[PDB]
């Protein structure tokens, strides 16, 4: 199994290297295909090798997988199987942190929370991979308030680092009751840039495919690179009029890191994107919106 995991990773990185070549290889194919379909001069860059493209074009069919994308390879079983999420905390947690980790279990369908004792960081990733855990969440705290969040996709998936800003928990609010706990509908709003499409994908795949008539709503709203997490359930009193009742925790997120590897590989994994605060134009730039 250890050799299998090492073998698969090299295939994953190796395919990532040639994704740019294959996109360039594909893009020049349609221009020739457009050139033959509508009788017009073949572009001079395609003037040579034109017959070779035609032969591969004639081979092209629906059966082939097509051009490879690293996002698809990372999230291979996103739709077919329901995700399995495990939630843990840092060593020696506070009382309020153990409340927060208890609430994230209810938010994510099918999540489980395990006590972090003396478990080294490396061993947890090994155990999660062995038992088929899809996603791993690690949460930090400062003076009884959660302050950091890490989301990791176990099969050599991307690792996303977050910092929390305005956390309000249900345990603060009296006599709320019990949650609906049904499979939720997802509302993603404000993500427009290419990186914004990347980040919204990571957050969406933490959830299973819901039912059509589900009344549970989870909203991720981006406003000036700050993502707002909101949890609501609605009741249709009558046509065109809807009532919203808030349930669940309320907190904000700020992304500053995405790494290709897992949280066991800080020393080897490459950085897809980092937040650089000491750039001269750092204060006047946003990345999740265009």
């Amino acid at each position: 199994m250890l050799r299998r995991e090492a073998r698969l990773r090299r295939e994953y990185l190796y395919r990532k290297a040639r994704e740019e070549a294959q996109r360039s290889a594909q893009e020049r194919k349609e221009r020739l295909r457009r050139a033959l379909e509508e009788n017009r001069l073949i572009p001079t860059e395609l003037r040579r090798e034109a017959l070779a493209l035609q032969g591969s074009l004639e081979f092209d069919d629906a059966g082939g997988e097509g051009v490879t994308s690293h996002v698809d390879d990372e999230y291979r079983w996103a739709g077919v199987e329901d995700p399995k999420v495990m939630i843990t905390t840092s060593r020696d947690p506070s009382s309020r942190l153990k409340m927060f980790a208890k609430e994230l279990k209810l938010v994510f369908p099918g999540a489980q929370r395990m006590n972090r004792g003396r478990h080294e960081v490396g061993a947890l990733v090994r155990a999660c991979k062995a038992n088929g855990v899809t996603d791993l969440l690690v949460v930090h705290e400062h003076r009884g308030t959660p302050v950091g969040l890490i989301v990791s996709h176990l099969p050599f998936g991307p690792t996303a680092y977050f910092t929390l800003c305005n956390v309000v928990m249900r345990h603060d609010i009296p006599d709320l009751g019990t949650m609906s706990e049904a499979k939720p509908h997802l509302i993603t709003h404000g993500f427009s840039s290419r990186l914004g499409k990347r980040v919204s994908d990571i957050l969406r795949y933490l959830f299973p495919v819901p039912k059509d008539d589900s009344h549970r709503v989870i909203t991720f709203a981006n406003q000036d690179d700050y993502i707002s997490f909101r949890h609501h359930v609605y009741k249709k009193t009558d046509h065109r009029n809807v009532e919203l009742t808030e349930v669940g925790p309320r907190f904000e997120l700020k992304l500053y890191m995405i790494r290709l590897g897992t949280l066991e590989q800080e020393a080897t994994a490459d950085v897809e994107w980092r937040w650089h605060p000491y750039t001269n134009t750092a204060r006047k730039r946003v990345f999740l919106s265009t």
Binding site: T219, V242, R283
Partner: protein
């Protein structure tokens, strides 16, 4: 430096300087009502 100037002198100086990064947004009722409006619109349209 610090020694030359009197104590708490800069509190009234009204100097001009720049900030490194954007301050965190402040939550208010107006933000809450606006955000609920976005969710309500998508619920009516069933634009999940």
């Amino acid at each position: 430096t610090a020694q030359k100037r009197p104590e708490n002198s800069l509190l009234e100086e009204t100097l001009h300087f720049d900030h490194a990064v954007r301050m965190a947004p402040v939550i208010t009722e107006e933000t809450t009502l606006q955000l609920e409006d976005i969710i309500k619109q998508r619920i009516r349209d069933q634009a999940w």
